Design a protein around this ligand. Sequence first.
Ligand SMILES: Nc1ncnc2c1ncn2[C@@H]1O[C@H](COP(=O)(O)OP(=O)(O)O)[C@@H](O)[C@H]1O
Ligand SMILES: [Mg+2]
Lengths: 51, 371
Amino acid sequence: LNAKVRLLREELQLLQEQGSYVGEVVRAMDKKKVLVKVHPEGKFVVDVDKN
Amino acid sequence: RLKLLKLERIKDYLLMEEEFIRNQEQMKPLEEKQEEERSKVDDLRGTPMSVGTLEEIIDDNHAIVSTSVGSEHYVSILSFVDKDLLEPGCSVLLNHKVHAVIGVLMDDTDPLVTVMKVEKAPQETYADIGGLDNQIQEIKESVELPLTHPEYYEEMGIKPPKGVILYGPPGTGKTLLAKAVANQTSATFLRVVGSELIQKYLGDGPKLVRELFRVAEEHAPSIVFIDEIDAIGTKRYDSNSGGEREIQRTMLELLNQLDGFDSRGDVKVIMATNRIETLDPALIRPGRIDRKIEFPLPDEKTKKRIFQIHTSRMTLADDVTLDDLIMAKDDLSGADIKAICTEAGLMALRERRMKVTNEDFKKSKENVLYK
Ligand SMILES: Nc1ncnc2c1ncn2[C@@H]1O[C@H](COP(=O)(O)OP(=O)(O)O)[C@@H](O)[C@H]1O
Ligand SMILES: [Mg+2]
């Protein structure tokens, strides 16, 4: 229960942070960069993280 | 003397470059660190969220870049760019903040080439072309040896023939010879037909014609195979009905592309026509098209050769004799011979006997004959 409620308090606290965009991968290249489309706006390249 | 010049300087290249560069490599350092420094500096040059479309280029260091939202913005280019790849209409890369031109990437084109270029090396080769030695040698003179040996013409003075017409009845291996030329030549042959360029609306036909010619010039110094054109234009008529007027415009654009004001690359035109007397007298102008070639119906010996080459991949029977088919002294194109062979095979298959028979070939003859 304590974990649940701590989670709730933090959830309220830091939901002020903005979310994320959903992009359609179009092409990939060297780990440094990978292409992706960000609907509705045009197609770009992104610097992927360490996933 | 020219050989001496080239050999001397070539040895100079080998010695200079190889020796000095290998000395530096033996002292490899002072290169990799600088390369890594430069690569990371380029990465530092903003690579966030980024893309750009090149509307046009003003000059070195300055150009206009438009985004999907119409962000036309003019920007000073960053020299890090590859440069010289900045053809208008190219997909540029732009910094998220300053929209700095730092990269360009398309790696994708209209698949018109992949549509109009199918089976670049068909199964038919000059071995598969049974007969017509004179026509074969003339078309080779016209097309291949200009390309495979660009020395004789260069040393003697003239440039090779540009357009070559192949005229004859409906079916004499015109497309076959086109295919064989494609297969034997390393150039990117282009198949084209006369029933597609007739577009629904004004300007469409000439537009695709000009695009096809530009594609031919760009991607490869190759052949363009224009099939029947008599369904197009048929000379320049009084120009009364709108459709025929537009088609006449399409031929005039073809004529400009065949020999226009500006220039023409190393792309050869090969026309295939069933009837030639009705074609534009001006289009065949000797300056543009030369080496019109008769492609007549095969004679008896040519018919023998055609049957043999068609049936090479056909285990004929011991009793099957391929002379009753040469017997017929009537219209039998190479296509007719292929149809006869295929019909004999199919009828044998239907009547369930694995081996074809003389009677089967006979029946194929009667059922392939149209008139
Ligand atoms: N040397 C040859 N001359 C003419 N036709 C041939 C020859 N060798 C084979 N053929 C046959 O001719 C057919 C192709 O004729 P094609 O080029 O379509 O004539 P057209 O283009 O006038 O319709 C093929 O089916 C092929 O089997
Ligand atoms: Mg043909």
